[PDB]
């Protein structure tokens, strides 16, 4: 799946728990573009080494706060719409 360009610019307010994750990788504000949320989420996945070393599009979050936020043990980075939905489910 793929996201139209205009949706990447959508201004969102992450819930406290998602904000905590983002803050851990440097984010200091309360309102972000979806693009910005995705940047910090990427940084968080990289720092915590949650992606598979062989197929680097698979992310393992079963034993992490990311997994509790997304309600999935794993996901593929290729599922753009599923990822956007998981972020929209954690706004305020």
């Amino acid at each position: 799946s793929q996201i139209p360009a205009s949706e990447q610019e959508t201004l969102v307010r992450p819930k406290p728990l998602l904000l905590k994750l983002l803050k851990s990788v440097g984010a200091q504000k309360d309102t972000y573009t979806m693009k910005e949320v995705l940047f910090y989420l990427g940084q968080y996945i990289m720092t915590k080494r949650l992606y598979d070393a062989a197929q680097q599009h698979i992310v393992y979050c079963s034993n992490d706060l990311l997994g509790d936020l997304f309600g999935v043990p794993s996901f593929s980075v290729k599922e753009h719409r599923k990822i956007y939905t998981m972020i929209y489910r954690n706004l305020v």
Binding site: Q8, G42, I45, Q56, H57, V77
Partner: peptide, 12 residues
């Protein structure tokens, strides 16, 4: 690809 390359496709 590297995780970064896949992730960059998702952000843009």
């Amino acid at each position: 690809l590297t995780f970064g390359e896949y992730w960059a496709q998702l952000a843009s």
